[PDB]
Structures are given as C-alpha cells and as structure tokens.
C-alpha cells in the first residue's frame with residue numbers, strides 16, 4: 001500500500017483502497033496490465049507535450 | 052509573462068488565447084477537450100464578443116498550426132464577483148471540435164484528492180501566456196512559459212492585501228521579477244508529474260506584475276473539478 005511512498009508506483013492517479021493501493025489514469029489513457037502504468041489511445045493524449 | 056523563458060514548439064500545446072473583434076488577444080485559456088476551453092470568469096468582460104485562437108506561438112509571423120474557433124456557449128460560474136474575484140472561472144463550449152496536432156493538444160484534469168496531495172505539494176508549476184512582459188510594457192507577441200514555485204498558504208495570506216478565498220491560490224516569487232501579467236488571465240497553470248501535465252490553476256490576479264513582497268493569485272482549479280465536470284455536459 002501507501003500512495004505516499006512513491007505515488008504507489010502508479011503512473012498518474014493513486015488510491016489507497018482499504019488495505020492496498022489502486023492506480024488509474026485520466027480520460028484518454030488506459031491502465032496497463034501491471035495496473036500501474038497509463039497508456040494513451042489517441043495520437044494526442046492529454047498532458048503530453050506534442051514533440 | 053515577466054521573466055520566464057519561451058514556449059517552444061509543442062511545449063505548451065494546451066495554451067489557448069481569446070481574441071477580440073479587433074483580433075487582439077486579450078486573455079488566456081486551457082484546452083481541456085476538443086470541445087471545451089477553461090478560462091477565467093473575469094475575462095468574459097474585456098470584450099463584447101470574442102473568439103478563441105489556438106495553436107499559435109507567435110502573434111506576428113504566420114505559422115501553420117494556428118486555428119480560430121467560435122464560442123457556442125459561455126459557462127460563467129454564477130457565484131463570481133468582480134468585487135472579490137471569487138470563483139474566477141468559466142468554461143467555453145466551442146462550435147467546432149479542436150483538431151489535435153503539433154502545438155495543439157488537451158491538458159489533463161486530475162482527481163481532487165490525488166491532485167492536492169501530489170500536484171500542489173510539488174515545488175513548482177507552469178504558467179504561460181501572451182501577456183504583458185514588464186507591468187508597464189506591451190502585450191507580448193510570442194507565447195512564453197514561466198516556472199513558478201508554490202507559495203505557502205499562510206505566507207500567501209500575509210503577503211496579500213485581499214482575502215484569499217478557498218477558491219484561489221498562490222504561486223510565484225517574492226523578490227524575483229517573474230510572474231504573470233496584463234492580458235495573462237484565464238491562462239493555464241499546469242503541474243508536471245512524470246512528463247504528463249495536469250491543469251492545476253487558472254490565471255486570476257495579483258497586485259501588479261512581479262511586485263516585490265506580492266505574489267500571483269491563481270484560481271484553484273482543483274476545487275472546481277466536479278463543476279468543470281458536469282460543466283462539460285453544459286450547465
């Protein structure tokens with residue numbers, strides 16, 4: 001648990017569901033398999049710099 | 052934008068400028084979605100009828116990613132009061148969806164809890180705009196970004212000369228001459244977390260530009276999520 005150690009190891013959002021931690025992303029991304037990363041779904045995801 | 056650097060290519064793609072009938076850019080904004088733009092409520096006054104330009108980095112040399120849009124519906128927060136600048140926030144519904152391409156993209160809205168606990172607890176955030184660059188100077192022609200550190204709430208309240216409601220927040224420098232300025236309102240204040248940016252505030256006000264002892268007040272977006280949310284459904 002602990003969304004306090006290092007954001008729970010999540011890529012973006014973080015939630016301490018009861019005993020453990022649960023990650024999530026903003027509209028546009030999708031939670032990877034590891035349930036910690038965030039994966040886009042469009043060429044232009046929010047928050048990303050268009051480089 | 053006093054001091055600060057210069058927004059390079061696709062380095063501030065969420066930046067949006069509100070233009071007047073004279074085509075002049077008078078305020079800022081933040082692209083939340085292809086249809087919705089986040090801005091300051093008090094900006095809906097320095098113009099009778101305005102439009103919103105996006106994907107523009109230089110207001111002189113014609114690039115290519117620019118694009119103008121028309122407000123279909125303005126959504127001013129009822130509770131706003133020019134008398135206090137409280138609830139300085141509005142959301143603009145565009146008629147034509149915005150087309151994301153280089154120098155054009157939406158910024159992420161965070162969760163209220165997570166955000167306040169991880170994004171405003173950070174050391175700094177980003178503010179950008181076409182605004183004045185020396186309090187007395189003229190409106191800038193190039194879009195620029197300024198890394199501004201967060202200000203201790205208490206220090207904030209003490210340094211001010213006005214009531215800092217729960218709806219606003221402090222960010223900037225005490226002595227350093229760096230801080231937003233004229234025509235920079237509505238602008239975006241974003242906070243970076245792992246290379247992805249989140250909307251952590253609207254450009255609201257301040258007592259001058261870069262004035263020593265004084266800071267720059269930002270509309271605490273975090274405290275307006277649910278509104279902005281059921282706002283992007285029009286309300």
Ligand SMILES: CCOC(=O)[C@H]1CN(S(=O)(=O)c2ccc3cc(Cl)ccc3c2)CCN1CC1CCN(c2ccncc2)CC1
Pocket residue numbers: 134135136186213214230231232233234235236254255256257258259260261266267268269
């Ligand atoms: C002498 C010139 O000053 C004034 O008259 C101008 C200057 N401009 S700016 O373009 O230079 C401006 C706009 C947005 C900013 C945003 C940030 Cl974050 C920092 C600095 C900013 C500076 C704003 C309005 N005041 C004038 C005042 C009017 C009275 N004010 C309040 C605040 C809260 N409750 C009740 C009243 C604060 C602001």
Ligand SMILES: [Ca+2]
Pocket residue numbers: 107108109110111112113114117
């Ligand atoms: Ca241009």
